[PDB]
Design a protein around this ligand. Sequence first.
Ligand SMILES: NC(=O)c1ccc[n+]([C@@H]2O[C@H](COP(=O)([O-])OP(=O)(O)OC[C@H]3O[C@@H](n4cnc5c(N)ncnc54)[C@H](OP(=O)(O)O)[C@@H]3O)[C@@H](O)[C@H]2O)c1
Ligand SMILES: OC[C@H]1O[C@H](O[C@H]2[C@H](O)[C@@H](O)[C@H](OCCC3CCCCC3)O[C@@H]2CO)[C@H](O)[C@@H](O)[C@@H]1O
Length: 219
Amino acid sequence: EKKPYIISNVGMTLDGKLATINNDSRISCEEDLIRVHKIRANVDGIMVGIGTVLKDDPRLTVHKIKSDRNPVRIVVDSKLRVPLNARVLNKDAKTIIATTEDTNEEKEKKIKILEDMGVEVVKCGRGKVDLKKLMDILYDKGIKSILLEGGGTLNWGMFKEGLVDEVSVYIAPKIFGGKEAPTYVDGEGFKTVDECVKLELKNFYRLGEGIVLEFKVKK
Ligand SMILES: NC(=O)c1ccc[n+]([C@@H]2O[C@H](COP(=O)([O-])OP(=O)(O)OC[C@H]3O[C@@H](n4cnc5c(N)ncnc54)[C@H](OP(=O)(O)O)[C@@H]3O)[C@@H](O)[C@H]2O)c1
Ligand SMILES: OC[C@H]1O[C@H](O[C@H]2[C@H](O)[C@@H](O)[C@H](OCCC3CCCCC3)O[C@@H]2CO)[C@H](O)[C@@H](O)[C@@H]1O
């Protein structure tokens, strides 16, 4: 054990938004979706936060590219708010819901239902999910590479703990605006430049009407 290699990918507007204030996220073009799916096809797991599941109900599977098998889907959900009918819980792939060790009668029942549906539930942390410990658990399961799709709040959590290895960002040629709109990285935020995350621009190229930037995280 140690922890998986983590790639953070996202599609954002020039002003760093992941969606409008009304959750409209038609940012990535077709070319970018193909690129993303190729990445999905090459990792052991895809990780996303409950916030994204609630707002977008994604499948998190390889569907617009030749697919053999799908990577494990991981959802960070502290209070187990994942809707019982969320697509991320369908049978297209294996799914793991990472929640906290906190408990109540209703939560335990929900866990039983999820397990009955073939969904695995991992308890890890108090108050909020302990990402570092979760990485150990996922590594022991054989998941050595994970595509982190976010969104904003989870990304903060991952970057704060320095668990991200590399970053790929697709920047769309548009501007959304909005102090309330979700950005690539939200959460608390670093107080000074000294403690912020450092990166190294490794590669970049246009894709469709936008551009892709690839960075390596300087740990
Ligand atoms: N354009 C893209 O590529 C892209 C990709 C992904 C998402 N998005 C967008 O991002 C938007 C906003 O997402 P969001 O920020 O509200 O949700 P999020 O970033 O996916 O985070 C969801 C939840 O994870 C939970 N969590 C549990 N433990 C955590 C920890 N240790 N660190 C951080 N989070 C933890 C938090 O709630 P609890 O404590 O209740 O569990 C948090 O609200 C979504 O609406 C979606 O449209 C865009
Ligand atoms: O564990 C999940 C369930 O939680 C509640 O069940 C109550 C249930 O409705 C309620 O009747 C029960 O208390 C029963 C009455 C007490 C009175 C004091 C002596 C012991 C028996 O307490 C349960 C919780 O411990 C909710 O009422 C249920 O809807 C929910 O499914």
